[PDB]
């Protein structure tokens, strides 16, 4: 039993957003859907949870009256919507089962989702521009630069390439803009053979990129 | 509401223990969460001193009154995370979290940065820019500074560094960028990037040579 998230958004303020957790196993049965965000750099906070097979949901006091929580338990997808959205919205937002109470209750929250980020912000959105970083072992890599909002995501070799990598936490410029790096480590006797490839998704813009990165 | 201490340490190898206090937990048992950076979080312990598929035995739970506790043997650098309490409110119908406690493993090495600075790339020079890449990594504790140089004279203009970010091996990372005209990049001999670590100094060159 696992939890599916829907991808990264950026909304203005007084807007609302809506963000899917999906069953992985097409179905709720008997469980609750929790929703529960984090702020960057903060606690969790629980916003409400829904229980699909009726449909039941509660609130938190804390978003009551702009917040809303729907399910289709035909398709194993739940929805939480929250709208009248503030800058102090931007969080990463979570999904986790719980169990049916009576039946288990002192069970927690399990499985948890991956999250997803939404940034709450009047900037416009701005998608990144890519560069290779040309190179025992050489590192070699892709620049991410100016970009606006978080989140970026970068693999190598299409997910082919893990060993080694090493994406860094981007950089908040004093413009307003991001810049990230990734880095491969990889034996310099691969440099005239081996193909490397960085892979750049960043969602708000639509921008998914390939850069090759080839010694000088 | 849900209280915890917001920091606790221990030995690598020795026993910690996070508390955990509220008035809910007179009504339900607490449940544990444990969360790495850039991570969801995962369940641990819940109910009484039950753990989930694949969390291993060092962890164990009880409860007292209105407390709980997180007991962790055997500490692992891997055991370094955030490690939150939650339970139903005294009303059941809601959940509550208390702040989380960080958790530090002490007894990890000294270790420098590891350095990589990159020139601009000709990509970016041919659309009339120029960065030069800081890459900073594997550094303990986590506490550097930046610093750049064009030949052997100081440049502050134009930088953008980040404050040091946990790793996932418990070590840190930082970055930083110098922004150039291709004109600047190509007038001087070298530009440098100059790493403070622990009383010592990194510093790297790249030459548009």
């Known amino acids: 039993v696992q939890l599916q998230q829907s991808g990264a958004e950026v909304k203005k303020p007084g807007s609302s957003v809506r963000v899917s957790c999906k069953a992985s196993?097409?179905?709720?049965?008997?469980?609750?859907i929790n929703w529960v965000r984090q702020a960057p750099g903060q606690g969790l906070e629980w916003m409400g949870g829904?229980?699909?097979?009726?449909?039941?949901?509660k609130y938190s006091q804390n978003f009551q009256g702009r917040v809303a929580i729907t399910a289709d338990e035909s398709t194993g997808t739940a929805s939480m919507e929250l709208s009248s959205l503030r800058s102090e919205d931007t969080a990463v937002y979570y999904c986790?089962?719980?169990?049916?109470?009576?039946?288990?209750?002192?069970?927690?929250?399990?499985?948890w989702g991956r999250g997803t980020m939404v940034t709450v912000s009047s900037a416009s959105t701005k998608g990144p521009s890519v560069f290779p970083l040309a190179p025992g072992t050489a590192a070699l890599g892709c620049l991410v630069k100016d970009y606006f909002p978080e989140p970026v995501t970068v693999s190598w070799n299409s997910g082919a390439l893990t060993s080694g990598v090493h994406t860094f936490p981007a950089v908040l410029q004093s413009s307003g803009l991001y810049s990230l790096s990734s880095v491969v480590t990889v034996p310099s006797s691969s440099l005239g053979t081996q193909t490397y490839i960085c892979n750049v998704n960043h969602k708000p813009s639509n921008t998914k990129v390939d850069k090759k990165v080839e010694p000088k | 509401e849900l209280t915890q201490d917001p920091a606790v340490s221990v030995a690598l190898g020795q026993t910690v223990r996070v508390t955990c206090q509220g008035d809910?937990?007179?009504?339900?048992?607490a449940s544990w969460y444990q969360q790495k950076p850039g991570q969801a979080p995962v369940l641990v312990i819940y109910?009484?001193?039950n753990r989930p598929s694949g969390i291993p035995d060092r962890f164990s739970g009880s409860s007292s009154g209105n407390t709980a506790s997180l007991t962790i043997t055997g500490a692992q650098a891997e055991d370094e995370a955030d490690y939150y309490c939650?339970?139903?409110?005294?009303?059941?119908?809601?959940?509550?979290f208390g702040g989380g406690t960080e958790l530090t493993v002490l007894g990890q090495p000294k270790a420098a940065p590891s350095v990589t600075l990159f020139p601009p790339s000709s990509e970016e020079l041919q659309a009339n820019k120029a960065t030069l890449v800081c890459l900073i990594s594997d550094f303990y504790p986590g506490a550097v500074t930046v610093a750049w140089k064009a030949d052997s004279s100081p440049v502050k203009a134009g930088v953008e560094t980040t404050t040091p970010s946990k790793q996932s091996n418990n070590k840190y990372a930082a970055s930083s960028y110098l922004s150039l005209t291709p004109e600047q990049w190509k007038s001087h001999r070298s530009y440098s990037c100059q790493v403070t670590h622990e009383g010592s100094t990194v510093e790297k060159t790249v030459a548009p040579t």
């Open positions: 986790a089962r719980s169990r049916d109470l009576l039946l288990f209750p002192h069970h927690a929250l399990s499985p």
């Open positions: 196993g097409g179905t709720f049965n008997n469980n609750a």
């Open positions: 829904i229980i699909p097979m009726f449909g039941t949901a």
């Open positions: 809910s937990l007179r009504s339900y048992y």
């Open positions: 109910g009484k001193n």
């Open positions: 939650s339970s139903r409110d005294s009303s059941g119908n809601h959940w509550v």
